[PDB]
Amino acid sequence: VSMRDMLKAGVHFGHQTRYWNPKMKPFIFGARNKVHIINLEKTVPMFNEALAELNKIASRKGKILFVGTKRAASEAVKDAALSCDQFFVNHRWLGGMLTNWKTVRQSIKRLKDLETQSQDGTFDKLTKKEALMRTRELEKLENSLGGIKDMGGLPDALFVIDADHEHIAIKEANNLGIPVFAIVDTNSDPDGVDFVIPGNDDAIRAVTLYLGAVAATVREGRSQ
C-alpha cells in the first residue's frame, strides 16, 4: 500500500487529542482540530514489513486468525478471512479463546456433531420442539465459532483490528508467543504488537484497505 493509497482512504485519521496513549508519540504526525494525526511515513513501511512476515507465515502453510469485534466491521473481517481461506473471530472475543484451546475444541466438536446429526437424521426421532431446540443451538454455535471450526489447532499468526479493544486477545497471544499483527490507533498501547501498524481502526474504508491488502498478500504467499 502506497502513502497516497492510504491517505485517500483516511488512514492518517486518529482519535481526539484528549484520548491518546503515551507510547504512541513516535507514530503521531501532530494534531489538527484537536484530532490526533497518524504519520503515514511510519505507517507504510511498517505495514509493508508486516506483510512480508505474513506472506512468509502463509507461505510456510501458516494458519491466520483475523480478529475484530466491531459491530460495523465484523462482516468485513469475516469476508477478509474467507477471501484467503483462513480463520477469524468477528463476534465478541471470548477469554481463553487461545489459552483455553481445549474447551474451544470441545465446543467445536459439539458444533460438528450437531451439523453432522442434522444431515444424518434422528431429528424426526426427536420431538419437533426438541429438534427445533437442537437446530437453534446449532445456529448459535455457527454464529459463535463459525470462523474457527476448521482451525484445527492454535493459529500461527494473528491480525487484530483496534488492538486496544481486543486487548485480551493480545495478552493471550503474548502468553503463548503467537505473533500479533494489529492496526493500532493513537489511543492503544503498542507494547503487545510485535509488528505494529499504527492507523485508524474504526473507519470502514481504511479497515477494508488493510484487510484487502493483507488478504492479497496472503493468497500470494499461499500460491508460491
Between 35 and 126, whose beta carbon lies closer to another protein? 126
| Footprint on residues 149-168 left by Zn ion (CB under 5 A) | 162
Question: Which of the listed partners (Zn ion, another protein, none) does 172 bind, with a CB threshold of 5 to 8 Å by partner kind?
Answer: none
Between 22 and 177, whose beta carbon lies closer to another protein? 177
Concatenated DSSP letters of 75-108? HHHHHHHHTTT-EEE-SPPPTTSSTTHHHHHHHH
Pairing of strands 157-161, 180-184: parallel
- Closest CB 107 distance from another protein, rounded Å: 17
Give the distance, in angstroms, between the CA of residue 165 and the centroid of all CA atoms in the same chain.
11
- Closest CB 104 distance from another protein, rounded Å: 17
Residues 135, 115: Cα–Cα separation, whole Å: 9
Give the distance, in angstroms, between the CA of residue 150 and the centroid of all CA atoms in the same chain.
16
- Closest CB 154 distance from another protein, rounded Å: 13
x-or-dash string of contact with another protein, 71-100, rule CB under 8 A = ------------------------------
- Closest CB 166 distance from another protein, rounded Å: 24
- Closest CB 125 distance from another protein, rounded Å: 4
Which residues does 32 contact at the CB level (< 8 Å), separation at least 6?
none
Residues 197, 54: Cα–Cα separation, whole Å: 13
Residues 153, 188: Cα–Cα separation, whole Å: 29
| Footprint on residues 118-147 left by another protein (CB under 8 A) | 122, 125-126
Question: Which of the listed partners (Zn ion, another protein, none) does 122 bind, with a CB threshold of 5 to 8 Å by partner kind?
Answer: another protein
Our finding on whether 103 is near another protein (CB under 8 A) is no
- Closest CB 122 distance from another protein, rounded Å: 6
Between 2 and 122, whose beta carbon lies closer to another protein? 122
Does an H or E element contain 42, and which? helix 40-59
Nine cell digits for residue 176 = 503463548
Tell me the CA end-to-end span of the chain in Å, nearest whole number: 21
Nine cell digits for residue 155 = 493459529
Between 186 and 217, whose beta carbon lies closer to Zn ion? 186
Binding interface with Zn ion (CB under 5 A): 162, 185, 201
Binding interface with another protein (CB under 8 A): 122, 125-126
